Amino acid sequence: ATFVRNAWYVAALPEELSEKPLGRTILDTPLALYRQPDGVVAALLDICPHRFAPLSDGILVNGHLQCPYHGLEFDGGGQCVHNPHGNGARPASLNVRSFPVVERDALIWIWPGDPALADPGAIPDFGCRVDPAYRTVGGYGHVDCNYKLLVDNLMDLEVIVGDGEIQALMKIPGGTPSVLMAKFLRGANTPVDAWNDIRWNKVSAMLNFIAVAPEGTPKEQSIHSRGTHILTPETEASCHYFFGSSRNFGIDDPEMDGVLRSWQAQALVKEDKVVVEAIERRRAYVEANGIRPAMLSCDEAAVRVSREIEKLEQLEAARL
Amino acid sequence: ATFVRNAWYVAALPEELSEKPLGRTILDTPLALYRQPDGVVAALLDICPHRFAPLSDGILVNGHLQCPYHGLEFDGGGQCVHNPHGNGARPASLNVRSFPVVERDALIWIWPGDPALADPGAIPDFGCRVDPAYRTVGGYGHVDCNYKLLVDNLMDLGHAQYVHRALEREVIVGDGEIQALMKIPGGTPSVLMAKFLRGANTPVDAWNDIRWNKVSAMLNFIAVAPEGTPKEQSIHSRGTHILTPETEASCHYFFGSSRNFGIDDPEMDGVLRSWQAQALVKEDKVVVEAIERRRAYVEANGIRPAMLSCDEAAVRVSREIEKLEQLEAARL
Amino acid sequence: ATFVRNAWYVAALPEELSEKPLGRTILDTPLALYRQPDGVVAALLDICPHRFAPLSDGILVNGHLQCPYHGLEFDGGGQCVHNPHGNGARPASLNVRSFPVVERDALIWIWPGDPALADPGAIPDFGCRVDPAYRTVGGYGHVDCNYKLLVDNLMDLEREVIVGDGEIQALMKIPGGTPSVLMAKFLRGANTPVDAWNDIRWNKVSAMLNFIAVAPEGTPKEQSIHSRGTHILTPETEASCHYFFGSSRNFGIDDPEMDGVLRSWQAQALVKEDKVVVEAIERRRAYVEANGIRPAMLSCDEAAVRVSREIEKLEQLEAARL
Ligand code: FES
Ligand code: FES
Ligand code: FES
């Protein structure tokens, strides 16, 4: 596959991690993701340097991940800290590869490329996920399609182009009938404007803005929800979906939490998950013939994000 | 893959189609087969020209199939007839391929190859399925084997279906049509078939004929008659046995029975609608599906089949099919 | 795939075979295994010479395997003995390949390569399996890993490694010990201070026989209370294999309760937690091969490394011939 490795991707949501490691594949790389007894998240290559057993099937022993096959022990940095055989010796060849991980904005970000180039300044800005003004709920979903098809889906219903960031803004005075959603509709009564924005950040992290407000008031003074919609490639033809909603209205609604923690309700439904997986199963045919997609007006935002990913995939491929 | 695309194939039975589209793959081509408001059947490539969503998961909107992804609308010809986006424009690139589809003899025929060569006069004659002189029942079956294995099985020496237990032989070969004939005067095993025997009582003649038409469409003739009565004035059933490749290693089987006996017998309809009784026994599906899993081994070693006496008709259908494979492989 | 075809491998346990044929694949070769009316075991290529049907889905007709498609009949040599078609003629083109098979030591051995080199004298010695002095129990397992990984797993006086011709032995005596020399099942023999042994023998390609022993003080190794475990692997595909496991013990011969706990034989030929490691190692093969990733060997690996490289040398010899 052709992946963009020198970039931050979400590998998990913080609640998924524990002292029991989680095995998850990121850009065709099996990682063992666990949280150390002092709370710091580690990401080790899920292939023991000895005879390749899966570290993610082990447990922590004195805060060290102990391989379930023969008991080599590893720290968050990948250094072998205990060898229970023979002279107990730990040459450098017993170290497992370690990945940069930064926990920020209720997200576990990982750098799968050159670990020396990992720069926390490049992590996309998702502060609303930790903002006490917002109520943030969400979850995880696995999808059997290449990540770019869900990037299209999400970049879909003014387009500003920046460096490693793209914005697709739509302001809707009144709409086709009423430009009010059921959750927004109960807020006020006087005539309203609505917004439907989404921001794309380098590789495949996205944040939308769904808003309704009386008359023509500050966009930020509206009743709104910011959607976390982040994709991380799993294999060339599969990916992980991290979705979440940060709402500023009816914050302490235990009922609203239920519908928004649903897979079909916050991200793509059953017919919407079926569309991307179904498109993916049609890839071999469209490629075998000369079948290229037919663009419409509503595709400008998606096409520009697609071209940014294409540039990045070619630029890294040029390196190797 | 290796298919003979310039030929007519059955893609569905009429009763499978309605205004809710059916997704079916024919010779590695995903089709959406649906019936328009006036009942006329359309056959579109199941890949929307926009972002490749499956049209078969859509519905009709004012009689037009609307893609469930972004709402483009198509007519029976694949023409884009509504664009709900932007200036609404409908350039030619928003057309989806349409395949020649002809509903005839209670079968839904499709031409999966070069549409310029699709000639409805070439569709094999399965008239007995609409002949009010006959009672016609049948159904559908899917099998995990290359279709030629089920064509071999059906062209096999005096081999009938389970519900059909019991001059001599003759194989006539023509252009894209083969007939393998058997007349059994009086017999030695049995001349009355279990389902037939309730016709008359005195000693009889028996027939077991089968017709093959270009690429995998077959119609057999299982017959019983007293003494020496006209072959066509006999008690008989015309069996519809049509195979359509799905993938290189799987296929669709459309089986049917056109009988002139027990026309108003619903008990008889039940068994003849049975896929193991009429088309393929469970032990035969296991053999053919098992042979398919052996294809990689026999090809990797040099293993060619050793033919017997009971194989004359099938080997000829096999060689006719192969020539057609060559005609297409040469063109491109 | 790269297999060692000029070698004996177990294809089954005798109780798996009967007059009902068994389909099993050995080194990418589909076999039909059945036992003839006189008890003699035959091994035919599971591909009928007519139209490639599974012979293994057939039945015996007068001791001859009858193909379930069209009824051809085969004897133990693969010879077609009945053709129910036409003039009944049976040209040689209707014979199916037959494989050398030798039933020995309650094992079904097969030579999947060149039949001209098949020498029953090269079958490894597993006599304890038929020794009336021993009580033998075991079974079968299929595992989704290349067989070398379960040879690695199993190859893992103090610890001494003996190397012979097509034979490697890894011996361990634990004199008295410091952790424990008493095993849970063994402890109910003697009680005053004890020695323990854990040896394992590997014979060419992938047949292994271990020795688990416990005995008081310093008594003869052959006079200990012990079990000789059968651990034989046979490749199925590039990435799957058959596991034949067994226990031949000299203690509690007539104990049917004892038969039960050793038939929970996850303990010697680890097959539940141990199936999980090798299948997981196998699923990582594409990554470790795609990068230049080689295993880092330790002190506990001398036996495994020598057996692995002998398996490797034999693979090259055959790839070299062709
Ligand atoms: S083999 Fe994984 S730690 Fe010894
Ligand atoms: S795929 Fe976009 S309109 Fe059908
Ligand atoms: S395939 Fe075995 S006899 Fe026809």
Side-chain angles (χ1 to χ4, degrees):
Chain A
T2 310
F3 293 127
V4 174
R5 311 199 64 89
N6 294 327
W8 292 98
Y9 299 84
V10 175
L13 305 176
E15 57 271 43
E16 313 189 88
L17 309 190
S18 65
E19 294 203 342
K20 182 189 176 186
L22 161 70
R24 184 110 85 203
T25 293
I26 302 301
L27 313 205
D28 277 322
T29 306
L31 305 178
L33 308 174
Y34 68 107
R35 172 165 269 117
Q36 303 169 279
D38 79 347
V40 180
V41 170
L44 304 182
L45 186 56
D46 203 7
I47 301 160
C48 179
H50 178 213
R51 281 186 170 278
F52 310 154
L55 295 170
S56 60
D57 285 337
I59 59 179
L60 260 47
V61 165
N62 301 128
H64 306 126
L65 182 53
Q66 173 192 66
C67 174
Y69 206 1
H70 309 93
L72 286 185
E73 301 182 13
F74 307 85
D75 68 31
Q79 195 169 59
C80 186
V81 308
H82 183 238
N83 173 8
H85 303 284
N87 50 3
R90 309 187 306 277
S93 58
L94 298 194
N95 296 327
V96 68
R97 178 178 177 180
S98 186
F99 290 77
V101 47
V102 167
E103 178 169 9
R104 175 178 297 173
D105 303 333
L107 296 179
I108 306 298
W109 293 88
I110 284 180
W111 188 279
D114 193 336
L117 304 176
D119 170 17
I123 297 180
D125 177 16
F126 282 78
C128 55
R129 290 179 51 89
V130 299
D131 195 326
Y134 290 88
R135 173 63 172 166
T136 303
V137 297
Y140 164 77
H142 179 269
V143 180
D144 286 316
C145 77
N146 181 292
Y147 69 118
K148 304 166 191 169
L149 290 180
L150 272 176
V151 173
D152 286 330
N153 179 258
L154 293 161
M155 292 293 99
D156 192 84
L157 40 72
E158 189 182 3
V159 174
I160 318 175
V161 182
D163 187 29
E165 175 167 315
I166 294 178
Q167 301 219 77
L169 277 54
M170 288 189 55
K171 185 180 183 180
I172 320 174
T176 301
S178 88
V179 68
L180 296 85
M181 281 82 40
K183 315 83 192 83
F184 290 58
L185 183 158
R186 225 160 40 260
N189 47 41
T190 190
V192 294
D193 275 342
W195 293 280
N196 196 307
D197 308 316
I198 192 155
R199 174 198 70 190
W200 169 84
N201 282 127
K202 222 170 75 162
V203 197
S204 68
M206 290 154 285
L207 180 69
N208 77 7
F209 184 68
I210 308 301
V212 166
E215 291 288 328
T217 53
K219 201 170 187 172
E220 50 276 0
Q221 299 284 58
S222 63
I223 285 182
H224 61 268
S225 160
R226 299 184 194 278
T228 305
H229 295 277
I230 306 177
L231 301 154
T232 299
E234 183 189 63
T235 64
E236 192 161 43
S238 56
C239 64
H240 306 280
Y241 193 170
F242 304 97
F243 59 93
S245 176
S246 297
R247 59 172 192 273
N248 73 335
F249 58 92
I251 285 172
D252 295 311
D253 189 329
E255 312 288 336
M256 201 145 317
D257 293 348
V259 57
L260 293 170
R261 286 196 266 254
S262 165
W263 157 261
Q264 295 190 57
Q266 214 314 300
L268 74 179
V269 202
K270 156 61 193 175
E271 178 171 86
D272 215 69
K273 198 191 158 174
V274 170
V275 160
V276 284
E277 280 176 355
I279 295 168
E280 189 62 39
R281 293 192 300 273
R282 284 147 171 75
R283 179 180 304 283
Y285 185 95
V286 304
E287 287 185 359
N289 304 276
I291 298 178
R292 151 157 87 177
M295 291 296 92
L296 300 177
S297 62
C298 69
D299 296 318
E300 191 197 326
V303 172
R304 294 188 172 278
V305 171
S306 183
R307 291 176 177 177
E308 276 295 301
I309 299 174
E310 188 182 51
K311 289 191 180 178
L312 295 177
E313 297 184 324
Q314 302 175 314
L315 296 187
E316 267 191 29
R319 302 197 166 189
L320 60 90
Chain B
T2 305
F3 297 124
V4 172
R5 307 196 64 93
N6 299 332
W8 291 96
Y9 298 86
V10 176
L13 298 172
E15 62 268 43
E16 309 187 83
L17 310 188
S18 65
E19 300 202 358
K20 182 193 173 188
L22 162 71
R24 178 112 79 199
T25 295
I26 302 302
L27 314 205
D28 278 325
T29 306
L31 309 175
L33 311 173
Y34 68 101
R35 174 167 270 116
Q36 300 174 85
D38 70 343
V40 178
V41 166
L44 305 181
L45 184 58
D46 201 12
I47 305 160
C48 180
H50 183 212
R51 287 186 174 279
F52 304 146
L55 296 173
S56 60
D57 290 344
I59 64 178
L60 264 45
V61 162
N62 303 131
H64 301 134
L65 180 51
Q66 173 196 67
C67 175
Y69 206 179
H70 305 279
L72 289 187
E73 301 180 11
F74 309 85
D75 66 33
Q79 195 171 61
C80 183
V81 304
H82 182 63
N83 174 7
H85 301 282
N87 54 7
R90 307 184 302 273
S93 60
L94 297 193
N95 296 330
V96 68
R97 175 175 173 177
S98 180
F99 293 80
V101 47
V102 170
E103 177 167 10
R104 178 180 302 176
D105 301 338
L107 295 171
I108 307 298
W109 291 90
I110 280 196
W111 185 276
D114 193 340
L117 307 171
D119 176 25
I123 296 181
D125 179 16
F126 278 76
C128 53
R129 293 174 56 88
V130 301
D131 193 326
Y134 290 114
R135 169 61 172 166
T136 303
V137 302
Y140 171 83
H142 177 267
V143 176
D144 280 320
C145 72
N146 178 290
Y147 71 112
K148 303 173 187 171
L149 295 183
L150 280 176
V151 172
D152 286 333
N153 170 251
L154 291 164
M155 291 295 104
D156 199 290
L157 190 289
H159 261 92
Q161 346 293 333
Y162 182 84
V163 84
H164 297 114
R165 290 154 286 166
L167 187 62
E168 38 164 284
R169 77 201 74 189
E170 192 180 4
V171 173
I172 316 176
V173 180
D175 180 28
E177 170 164 312
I178 297 179
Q179 290 217 77
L181 276 54
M182 281 192 52
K183 181 184 181 181
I184 314 176
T188 302
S190 177
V191 281
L192 293 160
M193 291 105 188
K195 188 173 69 274
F196 281 28
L197 202 162
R198 299 187 338 209
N201 43 43
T202 188
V204 294
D205 280 343
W207 290 276
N208 194 322
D209 304 322
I210 188 156
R211 179 196 75 190
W212 171 84
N213 276 132
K214 226 173 75 161
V215 197
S216 69
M218 288 154 286
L219 180 66
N220 77 4
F221 184 74
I222 306 301
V224 167
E227 289 283 59
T229 54
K231 198 173 187 172
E232 40 273 26
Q233 292 278 56
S234 63
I235 288 182
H236 59 265
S237 163
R238 296 184 190 282
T240 304
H241 298 274
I242 308 177
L243 298 149
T244 295
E246 179 185 59
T247 66
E248 182 63 53
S250 57
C251 63
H252 313 281
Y253 188 153
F254 304 85
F255 67 98
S257 171
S258 298
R259 63 177 197 276
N260 77 336
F261 59 94
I263 282 176
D264 301 319
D265 193 336
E267 307 278 334
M268 191 145 327
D269 293 350
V271 85
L272 299 168
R273 288 203 267 252
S274 165
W275 154 262
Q276 288 195 56
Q278 187 62 244
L280 201 66
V281 201
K282 169 157 188 171
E283 173 175 50
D284 286 336
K285 204 179 162 173
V286 172
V287 168
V288 293
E289 280 175 354
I291 297 169
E292 184 58 39
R293 291 187 301 272
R294 285 153 173 78
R295 177 178 304 285
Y297 184 91
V298 305
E299 287 186 0
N301 302 269
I303 300 180
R304 303 176 189 183
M307 295 294 89
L308 301 174
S309 61
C310 67
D311 298 318
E312 194 202 328
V315 173
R316 300 190 183 279
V317 170
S318 188
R319 292 177 178 180
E320 286 294 299
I321 297 174
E322 180 176 44
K323 289 188 181 176
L324 291 178
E325 303 185 324
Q326 303 178 312
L327 293 186
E328 277 190 35
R331 300 202 173 191
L332 59 92
Chain C
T2 304
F3 291 126
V4 174
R5 306 199 65 93
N6 295 329
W8 291 99
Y9 299 80
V10 173
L13 303 173
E15 54 264 44
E16 310 193 86
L17 309 189
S18 66
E19 299 202 0
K20 187 192 172 191
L22 163 69
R24 185 111 87 199
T25 292
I26 303 304
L27 308 210
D28 282 325
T29 307
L31 308 183
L33 310 172
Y34 65 103
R35 179 168 269 117
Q36 298 174 106
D38 66 347
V40 178
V41 166
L44 304 176
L45 188 61
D46 200 10
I47 298 162
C48 178
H50 183 213
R51 291 188 179 281
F52 309 150
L55 299 177
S56 61
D57 290 342
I59 64 179
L60 265 48
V61 161
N62 187 16
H64 302 125
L65 184 50
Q66 172 195 70
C67 169
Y69 207 176
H70 299 89
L72 285 187
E73 303 183 12
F74 303 82
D75 70 36
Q79 197 168 61
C80 187
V81 301
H82 183 74
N83 177 12
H85 302 287
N87 48 1
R90 307 183 305 274
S93 64
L94 298 191
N95 295 333
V96 68
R97 180 181 178 183
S98 182
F99 292 81
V101 48
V102 168
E103 177 168 9
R104 178 180 303 177
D105 300 338
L107 291 171
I108 308 300
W109 294 95
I110 280 196
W111 186 277
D114 191 331
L117 309 173
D119 174 21
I123 295 181
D125 176 19
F126 281 73
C128 55
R129 293 183 53 85
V130 301
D131 195 329
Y134 290 90
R135 166 64 173 168
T136 305
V137 298
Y140 164 83
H142 175 265
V143 182
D144 274 309
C145 72
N146 180 290
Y147 69 122
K148 303 169 189 170
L149 295 179
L150 278 177
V151 172
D152 280 338
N153 173 257
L154 293 168
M155 292 295 103
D156 200 296
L157 191 73
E158 60 116 351
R159 180 166 21 105
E160 191 65 73
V161 170
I162 312 174
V163 182
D165 182 9
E167 179 167 315
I168 297 177
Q169 290 214 74
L171 273 51
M172 281 193 51
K173 177 185 181 179
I174 312 176
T178 297
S180 177
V181 295
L182 292 163
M183 287 160 239
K185 178 176 64 273
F186 284 56
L187 201 162
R188 284 112 91 170
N191 46 37
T192 324
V194 48
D195 279 343
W197 284 280
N198 195 107
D199 311 323
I200 186 157
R201 175 201 72 190
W202 166 86
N203 274 127
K204 226 171 75 161
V205 198
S206 65
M208 291 153 287
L209 178 65
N210 72 5
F211 183 72
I212 306 299
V214 162
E217 301 285 49
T219 55
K221 201 169 187 170
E222 42 269 76
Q223 293 279 62
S224 67
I225 286 180
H226 58 264
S227 160
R228 296 181 193 278
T230 301
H231 304 279
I232 305 179
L233 297 151
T234 298
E236 182 186 60
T237 63
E238 183 60 51
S240 57
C241 63
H242 306 286
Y243 196 171
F244 303 101
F245 57 72
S247 178
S248 296
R249 62 173 196 274
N250 75 334
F251 57 92
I253 284 171
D254 292 314
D255 192 329
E257 295 283 2
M258 194 95 47
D259 291 342
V261 314
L262 287 311
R263 287 199 269 254
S264 291
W265 187 258
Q266 291 65 46
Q268 188 61 66
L270 310 96
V271 78
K272 162 60 196 286
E273 178 172 16
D274 215 68
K275 211 184 106 157
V276 172
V277 277
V278 288
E279 284 177 0
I281 294 172
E282 187 60 38
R283 294 195 298 271
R284 287 146 177 74
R285 183 179 305 283
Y287 185 88
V288 305
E289 286 187 1
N291 309 275
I293 297 180
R294 304 179 188 186
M297 292 292 90
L298 301 176
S299 61
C300 64
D301 295 319
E302 195 188 325
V305 172
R306 298 191 180 279
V307 173
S308 186
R309 293 181 179 184
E310 282 304 307
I311 294 175
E312 184 180 47
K313 287 190 181 178
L314 292 175
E315 300 187 324
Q316 307 176 314
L317 288 182
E318 272 189 31
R321 296 204 171 194
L322 61 93

